[PDB]
Symmetry: C3
């Protein structure tokens, strides 16, 4: 329906330009899914170990105070070793260019064929803290020293 | 204590089924830690460059409006080159199956042995924006054109 | 200005120690950007397939209820195959040590040279749900069974 539901009265609008209108709008595969699936605008073959920067045919306007995040899909990751070099890719609120996906073939022997119209990644949108750094001479200064860890990870 | 603290009165409940009750419940290694560590239910050896889909023995119910995120652990990543092909793995609110982790050995020469009961990943839970896409013919239309970047990244 | 703006009255402070004060404070490359870029404190050469744990010269105090996330930069990922083994790296609220970045060269043939003072990663800060796990015998118990997916992903 065109009626915005009760709880979800503050659902976030994402403006999108289909730079390649031959591709469907990105969509959630199932209700409640965190991401919308991005399509490839191109046919690409990746030999083992090779990477490509693949156009998705879309540009978005992530709201200020938020971030878009490009995540790999789990099925292709396991079945053929498809990954994303810079995962999770960070799409900034001021970016108005085309979203591109840095696919890489992490299989040792079998090439990966991507066809135009395949779903090759997923886009999440989340709030981000735009932090103000405060340089301190030590954490005790800031009142932040004794912790559950310390300088240990 | 069983008393929910002052500030943290709205702590998020995560329902979990131990499909493999021989494994401990996932836990935070230290107070304030972002994730709970996931266990492997199986023994697995990964030769250099090989990947596996590893059962964790748990199923969860991420709340609607949230997402579960499967992240690698830093120590194994550096010491032996252990990574996750689809990192960060995206666990959707409607998913009720077993959480699986797509481990991969990014070392060139040394095999990685995973034992049942090892902590092989960490699970974070975060809010996500379930966005409504609005297709526009250009960002100016939406009142969103002139930015700190432009189509540049 | 020193005046905190209207909307952004609740901007998050991140205390930071420059363990290596010869490096600039991390900064956002453009307004609205989700992350601040982390510098390398060292010169490092990565042969194809090799990884290193690289010091960034900073320690931070992520607030309780938040997480720091270390993400790769897209340009180096595509141009030279630079990635991060444990991406996204998880920086916990109680951590007070130096932030380190697990760089890896995913190119098959060309070495990557990192110079002291190069920007080698980006740090985001986000809220995280510090969840309370509730073990249930099945999701129906919790009132959470019938979904848009089921045990299917
Ligand atoms: O990219 C990273 C990730 C982690 N770290 C630090 C901060 C984090 O709080 C700490 C622990 O991270 P992990 O939980 O990913 N590592 P692991 O589980 O191996 O070790 P620990 O026992 O300390 O949790 O390591 C970094 O410096 N860089
Ligand atoms: O997966 C991605 C990541 C980034 N991008 C675009 C959007 C983002 O806002 C822009 C910059 O991303 P990075 O900061 O990760 N890249 P880098 O730091 O190399 O370049 P810049 O100088 O533009 O920040 O690149 C994509 O199209 N796909
Ligand atoms: O690391 C992960 C990622 C996903 N999953 C499960 C939960 C998630 O909700 C489900 C689907 O994840 P993806 O969307 O990344 N996979 P894909 O798009 O290939 O399949 P689907 O058609 O089910 O969306 O797979 C895991 O068990 N581990
Ligand atoms: Mg999917
Ligand atoms: Mg840990
Ligand atoms: Mg950048």
């Amino acid at each position: 329906s065109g009626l915005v539901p009760r709880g979800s009265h503050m659902s976030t609008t994402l403006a999108i330009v289909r730079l390649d209108p031959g591709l469907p709008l990105p969509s959630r595969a199932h209700d409640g899914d965190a991401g919308v699936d991005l399509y490839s605008a191109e046919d690409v073959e990746l030999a083992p170990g090779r990477r490509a920067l693949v156009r998705t045919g879309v540009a978005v306007a992530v709201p200020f105070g938020m971030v878009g995040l490009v995540h790999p899909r789990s099925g292709l990751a396991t079945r053929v070793g498809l990954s994303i070099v810079n995962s999770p890719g960070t799409i900034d609120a001021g970016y108005r260019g085309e979203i591109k996906v840095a696919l890489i073939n992490l299989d040792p022997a079998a090439p990966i064929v991507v066809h135009r119209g395949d779903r090759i990644a997923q886009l999440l949108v989340q709030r981000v803290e735009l932090v103000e750094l405060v340089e301190v001479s030590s954490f005790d200064e800031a009142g932040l020293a004794s912790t559950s860890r310390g300088d240990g990870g």
